[PDB]
């Protein structure tokens, strides 16, 4: 019916796809290096609402750079040095029964993306820049300072059909309309600086284009809601003698 989730903001919704069968958990579940778990960080930081138009190709948001300007979480990234967090991502779209379309909501860990021109470098403002849904494009990209952005190769050169390895959920408008992906913390170092490294990239890819018939709303609003869970940081105080 409606299992109203409350944290400090409320989100009414009504499966959970765990990243690899591992829930987010503190590093303490395992002086010299004390840690400081911040337990006030979690709450639903709802991002902007993209419009799924008929002629659209796809969208991606780099994490944790999407939440770099979002409240307390944003502040802690500036203050503290080392930090680790897991995320509960709720991607919900709202559409009628006269709208037809398919989406692949996929969380890709560590996606390095090649430049548009082979053997050229691009700025950090070409991948992420606060909360923005960067848009994949049809055909090639010939703008030198941009990412490759060819939808069929997913901007990584891997083939778009094979992205089903990663924890993914399909939002087929015919039946369901919600995707919950609980991504745990995956890195090769216990905790890392949250500016240098973009941990994972969320991609929403329309596999079937929207057809809306006639005299109906021409866009389907896709909203992304991210709640950072079990976020730990580093202590800022001295140890005892």
């Amino acid at each position: 019916r409606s299992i109203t989730l409350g944290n400090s903001t409320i989100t009414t919704q009504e499966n959970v796809v765990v990243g690899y069968g591992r829930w987010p958990t503190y590093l303490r579940d395992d002086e010299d290096q004390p840690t400081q778990p911040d337990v006030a960080t979690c709450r639903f930081y709802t991002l902007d609402s993209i419009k799924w138009e008929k002629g659209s190709v796809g969208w991606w948001w780099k994490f944790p750079e999407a939440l770099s300007d979002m409240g307390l979480f944003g502040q802690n990234m500036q203050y503290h040095y080392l930090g680790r967090a897991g995320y509960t991502i709720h991607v919900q779209c709202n559409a009628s029964k006269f709208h037809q379309g398919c989406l692949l909501v996929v969380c890709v860990p560590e996606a390095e993306m090649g430049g548009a021109v082979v053997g050229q470098a691009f700025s950090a403002t070409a991948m992420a820049n606060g909360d923005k849904a960067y848009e994949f494009t049809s055909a090639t990209q010939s703008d030198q300072t941009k990412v490759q952005t060819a939808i069929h190769n997913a901007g990584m050169g891997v083939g778009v059909g094979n992205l089903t390895i990663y924890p993914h959920q399909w939002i087929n408008l015919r039946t369901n309309n919600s995707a919950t992906i609980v991504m745990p913390y995956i890195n090769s170092v216990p905790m890392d600086n949250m500016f240098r490294h973009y941990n994972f990239t969320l991609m929403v890819i329309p596999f079937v284009k929207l057809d809306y018939a006639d005299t109906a709303s021409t866009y389907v609003p896709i909203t992304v809601t991210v709640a950072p869970m079990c976020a730990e940081y580093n202590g800022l105080r001295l140890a005892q003698a």
Partner: protein, 106 residues
């Protein structure tokens, strides 16, 4: 929400504490206390608000509401709907010292 039975969308009913200024953007509003009211799965959103006092400018709370998705309808449905609003005195109130109304004049 009193409207068509085929409309869907989301709203951000946001509450500002007594001292706080009303938010000027949806982004500002979202940082505070907010309820994402889904018009599709619910059609009534009940908000019990505390710290309601006489205050005889003034410190007063604010309830604002913002578009989040817009209204989406299928073919053959009106392009307008409305929202009605209700008010009550909740569980208990306390009133002290009689006074005449400043409405109907003698």
């Amino acid at each position: 929400f009193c409207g068509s039975a085929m409309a869907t969308g989301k709203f951000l009913i946001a509450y500002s504490p007594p001292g706080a200024n009303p938010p000027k953007t949806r982004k500002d509003a979202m940082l505070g206390t907010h309820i994402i009211w889904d018009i599709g799965l619910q059609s009534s959103c009940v908000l019990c608000v505390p710290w309601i006092s006489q205050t005889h400018y003034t410190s007063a709370g604010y309830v604002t509401c913002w578009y989040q998705t817009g209204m989406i309808v299928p073919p053959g449905t009106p392009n307008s709907s409305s929202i009605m609003c209700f008010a009550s005195a909740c569980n208990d109130f306390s009133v002290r010292m009689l006074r005449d109304t400043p409405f109907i004049s003698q």
